[PDB]
Structures are given as C-alpha cells and as structure tokens.
Amino acid sequence: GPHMRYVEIHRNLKGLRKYMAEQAKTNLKLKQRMGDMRREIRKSVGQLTTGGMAANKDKQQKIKSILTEALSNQVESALVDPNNFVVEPRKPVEGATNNDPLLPSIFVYLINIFAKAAISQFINEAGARPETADPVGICVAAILSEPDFLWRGASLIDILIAKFRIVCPVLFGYRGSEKTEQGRQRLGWWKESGQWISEQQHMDRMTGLGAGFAAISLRKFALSKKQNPYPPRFYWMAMAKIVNTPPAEISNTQCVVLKAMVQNYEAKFIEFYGSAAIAALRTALIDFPARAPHKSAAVNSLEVLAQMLKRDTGLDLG
Amino acid sequence: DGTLVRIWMPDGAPAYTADTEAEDPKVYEDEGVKRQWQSFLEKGRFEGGMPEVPPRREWCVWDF
Ligand SMILES: O=P(O)(O)O[C@H]1[C@H](OP(=O)(O)O)[C@@H](OP(=O)(O)O)[C@H](OP(=O)(O)O)[C@@H](OP(=O)(O)O)[C@H]1OP(=O)(O)O
Ligand SMILES: O=P(O)(O)O[C@H]1[C@H](OP(=O)(O)O)[C@@H](OP(=O)(O)O)[C@H](OP(=O)(O)O)[C@@H](OP(=O)(O)O)[C@H]1OP(=O)(O)O
Ligand SMILES: O=P(O)(O)O[C@H]1[C@H](OP(=O)(O)O)[C@@H](OP(=O)(O)O)[C@H](OP(=O)(O)O)[C@@H](OP(=O)(O)O)[C@H]1OP(=O)(O)O
Ligand SMILES: [Zn+2]
C-alpha cells in the first residue's frame, strides 16, 4: 500500500540522483549548471529559518526561478516518467497545465533536492527552535503548489512525504520499542556512521520533524488561487494514529512527536476543525498521557502543554 | 483565563472546503465511520478514542 509505494519512491529518488551524475559525464550543459542549481536551492532553503517575511519571499522566488529553468530543460537532461515518484499513477486531466507523460530529470531531481533541504532544516534547526519550521513549511507549500510545477493536476509532494516516512515513521502509524533494535528501526531512530545516535539527539530530530510535519499539513489556501498540496486531513489522520495506540505500545518517541505537532499549531488546528479539534486535543493532551503506563518526562510534557493552553490561551480541554 | 475567553474571531464558520474532509467522501456512509463519530455528535467529545477519518464540516461548530 502507501508504505510500499513511499519506500519505492524513496529508492527511485536515490537512483535518480545517481543517474544525474552519470548524465553529467556526457552532457556538458548539464555538468555546467547542475551543481550551481543544487547549491542555490540548498542555500536559499537554509536562509528561511533566519529571515523575515520579505526576505523569505525573495528566497522562495529564487527557488521558483531555478525550478522554472529546470522545467524548460535547456540543459537537455533525460526525461523520466513522473509516475515513479507519486503514490498513485496519474492519467491526463482536462484543463491541467502539464499533462505530459514525461518530465525533465533535472526538474524532478531538484524537487528532490528541495525536499531533502527542507527535511534537513526541520532536523537541524526546528529540533532546537520548533518555531523555525513554519517558514520552511510555508516555502514548501508555496513552491509545490505553483501551477507550473503541477503534474497532471496535482503536486509532486509525494517526493517530500516519501522522505518524511523514512525519518519520522510514527507520523504514519508505526510503533516500536525504544529498547529493541527492531523497535528503534521502526521508530526511525537514526544512526551516525553505523552507531545509534544518542537519545537526546533522537528526540531533537523527532521534535523538528513533528513541527515540520505540522508546518506543511496545517497551511491555509482559502485566500489563495493555489490548491493546498497537503491539506489538513493528513494532519488529523496522523494525530489519530498516534493517540489511539494501545497503552503497552506507547513510546516517548510518539509523545515527543505529538507535542511538536501540537504546540503553536492549536489555533490553526481549530480553524480547520473547530469543536472537533477541541475534542481531539483533549484526547491528545489529557486522555493519551493519562493512559500511558510509563510516566516519563515526555508523557508529562503533554500534560504541561494542556495546563499552559488553559492558563495562557484560556482553552479548557477538561 | 479568570473570565470568559473568546477563541473564534470571524463572523461565522469558515467557508466550506473539502481539504479538511476525508479524501473520499464515500467513507462517511460506512457503519464504522458513523460509529466512531456517533459519540462526538451526541456528547461532543471522544470516548473510544479519536476517529481516524476527519469530520464532515457540518459536524463541527466554531461558536466558542
Ligand atoms: O536516508 P538514507 O536511506 O539513510 O539515505 C541517505 C540519505 O539519502 P535519502 O535522501 O535518499 O534518504 C542522505 O540524505 P540526507 O538525509 O542527508 O538528506 C544521503 O546524503 P546526501 O545528503 O549527501 O544526499 C545519503 O547519501 P550518500 O551515501 O551519498 O551520502 C543516503 O545514504 P545512502 O547511500 O544509503 O543512500
Ligand atoms: O560527501 P558526503 O559524504 O555526501 O557528505 C556531505 C558533505 O559533508 P562532509 O563533507 O562534511 O562530510 C556536505 O558538505 P559539503 O561538501 O556540501 O560542504 C554536507 O553538507 P552541509 O555541510 O552543507 O550540511 C552534507 O550534509 P547535508 O545532508 O546537510 O547536505 C553531507 O551529506 P551526508 O553527511 O548526509 O551524507
Ligand atoms: O498564488 P497566491 O497563493 O495567490 O500568492 C500570491 C500571489 O503570488 P505570485 O506573485 O507568486 O503570483 C500574488 O501575486 P499575483 O499572482 O496576484 O500576481 C502575490 O502578490 P504580488 O501581486 O505582490 O505578486 C502575493 O504576495 P503578497 O501577499 O506579498 O502580496 C502572493 O501571496 P502569498 O505569498 O501569501 O502566497
Ligand atoms: Zn545529507
């Protein structure tokens, strides 16, 4: 199902990147531009976390210019079937801007670079300062929803989600023990040079990815002529999978991701779901911590968050 | 917060959008989905847990 396909997408993207390097050995125009385009996307994404609305809009325009150049394919890179990088195969749609059955590999490649850079900003910056996820998320949603970058009526955001599934599996319903090797692998516990990262580094990754997932799944397109490429139903579904876990299978990983999905995103959650969001917050921050057998600092942080919501924003989840 | 707090500022609920509803609305006529949401419509909160399918917008209110 979706799991299998996202794994296949993730490995198709690996081979695409290898094949871009192979092309550059025989394509001089590709060789002369490909590296600079990659570096300019990564640099621009890296400047979002430390910038204001106007500066961030400029970085977004820069990325859109590079992707526009890639789509025109003046470097004459090989073409590829984009169905290798979306969950469900797409057939032509009437009125769509781009119904071509093939896209330039340089274009797909740089979407992948863009998605990889966004993921890295969540991990490296939102892990310490979760507030920095929001501008990265805005940029992701703005770029992927650009009418010129839609393929057969919908965005290519499956390239980003395929990677999210790798690095934060709990957002997609996966569970495991932090005390077993198989469990750490199911939870996305990362490795650095073959050895498990520290628990503290693992929880920082989960914090940044929790906040980054919310940043891309809780965006407002009502006042925009663009379509939402990853709408809030996916936020609702992800939170539900976490908060319905049987008590024996609950891990601090889930609780850390959950706090990061929620904190600072309550107002947006309520805007989309109103009173249903209140009931879901009650489940996430009152019922879920109460029925967790191992009362950890991670479990307790969810309860403290409920207290703060009541003391600060005046929201009564009880 | 000591006194009454008003959360929703706009005048009335947001305009209808399918983006918050289930990807395929054919699931709302399933007995399973109806049962998950039955408790919410009645009591206004989740008892058996959070429904895995997001609500229809008609089931939500924004007057608080
Ligand atoms: O996530 P993994 O399955 O462990 O694979 C990683 C990952 O690539 P993916 O984007 O395909 O996941 C790294 O990317 P980041 O997470 O850092 O974005 C990439 O490193 P680069 O940053 O250099 O692209 C690295 O590739 P490499 O081994 O060439 O450094 C590659 O490892 P694999 O060789 O196992 O695919
Ligand atoms: O050559 P790789 O094994 O693929 O490693 C690269 C390389 O890192 P190191 O040379 O320091 O090991 C990149 O550095 P540059 O050559 O671009 O300067 C670094 O990029 P940043 O230093 O800009 O972060 C990138 O990491 P990232 O995933 O952030 O792009 C990292 O890739 P991996 O360690 O993930 O393989
Ligand atoms: O596509 P939208 O979601 O409606 O985004 C609009 C749109 O952006 P583009 O410049 O990319 O097209 C506006 O431009 P027009 O499409 O109407 O030409 C732009 O305003 P400008 O007219 O100044 O380009 C505005 O940006 P801003 O709110 O800063 O005026 C921006 O909104 P978002 O950046 O919030 O999506
Ligand atoms: Zn890397």
Author numbering:
A (entry chain C): 212 to 311, 312B, 313 to 529
B (entry chain D): 494 to 557
Sentences from the paper on this structure:
To evaluate whether the mode of interaction observed for S. cerevisiae Gle1CTD•Nup42GBM was conserved in other eukaryotes, we determined the crystal structures of human Gle1CTD•Nup42GBM at 2.8 Å resolution and of C. thermophilum Gle1CTD•Nup42GBM in the presence and absence of IP6 at 2.17 and 2.65 Å resolution, respectively. The overall structure of Gle1CTD is conserved between fungi and humans, with minor differences resulting from small insertions or different loop sizes. Both human and C. thermophilum Nup42GBM adopt the same fold as S. cerevisiae Nup42GBM and recognize the same surface on Gle1CTD, with the critical hydrophobic residues nearly universally conserved. Similarly, C. thermophilum Gle1CTD•Nup42GBM undergoes minimal conformational changes upon IP6 binding, which are mostly limited to a loop directly adjacent to the IP6 pocket. IP6 binds to C. thermophilum Gle1CTD and to S. cerevisiae Gle1CTD in a similar orientation, suggesting that IP6 could function similarly in C. thermophilum as in S. cerevisiae. The interaction between C. thermophilum Gle1CTD•Nup42GBM and Dbp5 also required IP6, consistent with the evolutionary conservation of the IP6 binding residues among fungi.
